[PDB]
Design a protein around this nucleic acid. Structure first.
Lengths: 123, 150, 205, 129
RNA sequence: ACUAUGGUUUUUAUU
RNA sequence: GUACGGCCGCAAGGUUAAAACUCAAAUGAAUUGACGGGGGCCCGCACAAGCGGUGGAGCAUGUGGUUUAAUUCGAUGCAAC
RNA sequence: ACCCGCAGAAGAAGCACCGGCUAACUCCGUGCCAGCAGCCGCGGUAAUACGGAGGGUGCAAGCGUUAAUCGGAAUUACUGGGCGUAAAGCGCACGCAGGCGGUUUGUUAAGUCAGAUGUGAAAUCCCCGGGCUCAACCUGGGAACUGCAUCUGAUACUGGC
RNA sequence: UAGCUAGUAGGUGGGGUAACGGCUCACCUAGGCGACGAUCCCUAGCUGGUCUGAGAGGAUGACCAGCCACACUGGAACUG
């Protein structure tokens, strides 16, 4: 734009991702859960996956994936919800945390043990 | 000794009936001695065939550039085929530095002390040309001995 | 960290002796470095295009026991007062208190020398120093504390130091275990197990 | 239409030098003959001559010595809509000291040398090498 | 003057 | 040009013109194949036309369907039987 | 705090990564299933892509995963963007209010350039003397903060007349 | 959001405060403010500082030093 045009008004601004504060600008929050159901994947594939529907006290309503070698969940069971889209499971922008609340932990590993949540046996 | 360098070798296959067959493109610099720079393209089946086919072309062309102290006399910009190259003088010892397609032109001129960057296009066949245009925009003297009289 | 694992498997993988676990059984043969050529081809099948300088960068770190973040900081401070990263970088590593305790001969390895420094047994100009990265300057006096002067490994390390190449830039007395720096080490003598076109573009490469 | 007598001054020289011409001619003005007097003193041109009863026109002669052009940069810097002003130590070192700049000042058109020697600054008019 | 339709994925060499 | 308000028209309309949602795309150029109810010069027995057939009967010799205990597994448009 | 002794290897190591980009990789099992994926995409009988196993790679009292900000980003473009088509030049004519305007003189001093006196809080960067090894920190002296005001020159260009 | 406003815009006379002004009243006048965005609405501790990159530039101002405001929600101000 010309010097005269820029002295009148500068160029318009853009914001890449930080435009909607849906999860209150955190990586994770808590949700009580309102619904449990299965979502079907992009392209015909056996990879059908369970999800939990969560409603937030800021007015947002979202869908979370429940991965972690199992499923024990029902409505009002209370779980933690983290940012994490599933690129083949449409509308699912969030992911479940198994470090806390009623969402159970996983089997013990030597590799990939910083994922989900791992307890020690008495041994 | 004649000055030479290989810049890069890339696979540049041939589309054919039933699929594909494989060839290589080489980018080189030679010319006619130090600070007398000539460029070479060559494509062939096999890598060493392409390299020599390029160097025999780099021995047909040359440009004699102003580099009378073997170093950048001033900071300079050069441009060719969307590639833009900026060069400024630096200290000698670890001062090389700069991407291979700029560096190859500097090595065949005996320059080892720079700080240089590419802008716009990083297409290597043109970054080399933009560096050789930057050396066309380089100067020598101390022109107070030529412009003024005496 | 000190890695704390088996040592000779590192030198064998670099085809270069790193002075790790050196002395006695490690002098005159049976270190087996570059003696296993494989059953077919050079085992470089493949292997990575950046393998140099990348393995040379681990070599120059591991051979002084110096960690990445500190080695990167050495590459930045080495440039001051026209010092050149092709000269001052190596003279800073050789001027470390853990290398000076190794070059004065009180440690048989740079690890053994570091383990005198950190274990509160070393002094610089009469002051106790536990920092292995302390830079020794052309007037510094380095010595051991009385609680360690008669230790077995320290006396055995001096029996190897007299067979090693003499560092002419310093002085030492073994009966007091006290020495002095007289000159900064220079590239015209200070020579290393690294190639001449490598680690001169360290980081961002 | 035409706003600035300097906006068609240096183009003639840069384009005429590219055409390998020994002389370049322009409509005359106070600042054009003030710039030419300094470019002759600093040896960037050989001579200049000015004549016309209807319109005074100024012709200056280009240096090539034995074939190669002697002026290796010809730039303006500054324009009436967006002027450049430099202070006594902010005065430029053109082509990293291989070239020179020309300034207008309160004492009249002079080099960046003559301005820094006079301990003063001012407005930019030309950049050369 | 015979011609509308035709689900998915697809092969060679690189340090 | 989808939505909301404002302006303007007798009206169709004229003007300003998003957001959410969603994908690694849209798009300019030049290059080589291949395809056409496309072009030019043209060849094949391919079209054409002068004849002989196979297709209908009975019998034989291979391939599907049907079936049992097996009624074997492939080949199977041009390129099988 | 610091000194002296009693003490015995004793009480002390993780987590991520290894088809191509991309460091280090092979064998087992699963057999489009289960379990994965930054992009190209993995898994149907050699899976270097899942789970394990044996060996390597990386950093370390840390190592890692995420919703996001700065870099890479000159792809927001001042230093430093673009308008024939790829994306933006108004279908056209005239023109108020805005932006811009030859040249000889003087004069105004808004603006520029030059010189001072005030001020620009202390921490603090950077130089540098102490204090704890280095340094975080406490500081002792310097510097900069191009600014702004108030006095005063130059008298050239721009606006003004 | 393109128009907005009635102590808004100017005068005359009182009172008020340690002192100023429409500051607060009562009356005469109709002006005043707008594309350099008035009017209105949403958001909001500010700067020393902080992080980033070679820097420019960008994202941002806990603590820190200084300054301005607040004391459950709200009015009046008084003491000194």
């Amino acid at each position: 734009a010309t010097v005269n045009q820029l002295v009148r008004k500068p160029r318009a601004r853009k914001v890449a991702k930080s435009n909607v504060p849906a999860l209150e600008a955190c990586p994770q929050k808590r949700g009580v859960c309102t619904r449990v159901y299965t979502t079907t994947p992009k392209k015909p594939n056996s990879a059908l996956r369970k999800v939990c529907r969560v409603r937030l006290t800021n007015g947002f309503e979202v869908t979370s994936y429940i991965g972690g070698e199992g499923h024990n969940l029902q409505e009002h069971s209370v779980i933690l919800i983290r940012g994490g889209r599933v690129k083949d499971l449409p509308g699912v922008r969030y992911h479940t945390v198994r470090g806390a609340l009623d969402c159970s932990g996983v089997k013990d590993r030597k590799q990939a043990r910083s994922k989900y949540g791992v307890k020690r046996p008495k041994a | 000794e004649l000055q030479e360098k290989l810049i890069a070798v890339n696979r540049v296959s041939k589309t054919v009936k039933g699929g594909r067959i494989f060839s290589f493109t080489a980018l080189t610099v030679v010319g006619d001695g130090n600070g007398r720079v000539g460029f070479g393209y060559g494509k062939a089946r096999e890598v060493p065939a392409a390299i020599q086919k390029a160097m025999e072309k780099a021995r047909r062309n040359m440009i004699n550039v102003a580099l009378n102290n073997g170093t950048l006399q001033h900071p300079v910009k050069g441009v060719h085929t969307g590639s833009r190259v900026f060069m400024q003088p630096a200290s000698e010892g670890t001062g090389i530095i700069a991407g291979g397609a700029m560096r190859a032109v500097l090595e065949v001129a005996g320059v080892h002390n720079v700080l240089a960057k590419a802008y716009g296009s990083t297409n290597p066949i043109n970054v080399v040309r933009a560096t050789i245009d930057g050396l066309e925009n380089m100067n020598s003297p101390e022109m107070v001995a030529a412009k003024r009289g005496k | 960290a000190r890695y704390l694992g088996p040592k000779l498997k590192l030198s064998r993988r670099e085809g270069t002796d790193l002075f790790l676990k050196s002395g006695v059984r490690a002098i005159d043969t049976k270190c087996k470095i570059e003696q296993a050529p494989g059953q077919h081809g050079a085992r470089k099948p493949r292997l990575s295009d950046y393998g140099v300088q990348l393995r040379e960068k681990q070599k120059v770190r591991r051979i002084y026991g110096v960690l990445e973040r500190q080695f990167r900081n050495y590459y930045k401070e080495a440039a001051r007062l026209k010092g050149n990263t092709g000269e001052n970088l190596l003279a800073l590593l050789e001027g470390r208190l853990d290398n000076v305790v190794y070059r004065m001969g009180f440690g048989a390895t740079r690890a053994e020398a570091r383990q005198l420094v950190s274990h509160k047994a070393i002094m610089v100009n009469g002051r106790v120093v536990n920092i292995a990265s302390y830079q020794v300057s052309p007037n510094d006096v380095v010595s051991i504390r009385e609680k360690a002067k008669k230790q077995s490994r320290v006396k055995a390390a001096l029996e190897l130091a007299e067979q090693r190449e003499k560092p002419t830039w310093l002085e030492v007395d073994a009966g007091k275990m006290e020495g002095t720096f007289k000159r900064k080490p220079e590239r015209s003598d200070l020579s290393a197990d690294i190639n001449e076109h490598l680690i001169v573009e360290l980081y961002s490469k | 239409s035409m706003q600035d007598p300097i906006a068609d001054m240096l183009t003639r020289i840069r384009n005429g030098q590219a055409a390998n011409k020994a002389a370049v001619t322009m409509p005359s003005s106070k600042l054009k003959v003030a710039i030419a007097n300094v470019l002759k003193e600093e040896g960037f041109i050989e001579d200049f001559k000015v004549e016309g009863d209807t319109k005074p026109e100024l012709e200056l002669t280009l240096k090539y010595f034995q074939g190669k052009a002697v002026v290796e940069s010809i730039q303006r810097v500054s324009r009436p809509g967006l002027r450049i002003y430099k202070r006594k130590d902010e005065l430029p070192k053109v082509m990293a000291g291989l070239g020179i700049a020309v300034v207008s000042t309160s004492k009249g058109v002079m080099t960046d040398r003559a301005a820094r020697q006079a301990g003063l600054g001012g407005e930019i008019i030309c950049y050369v090498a």
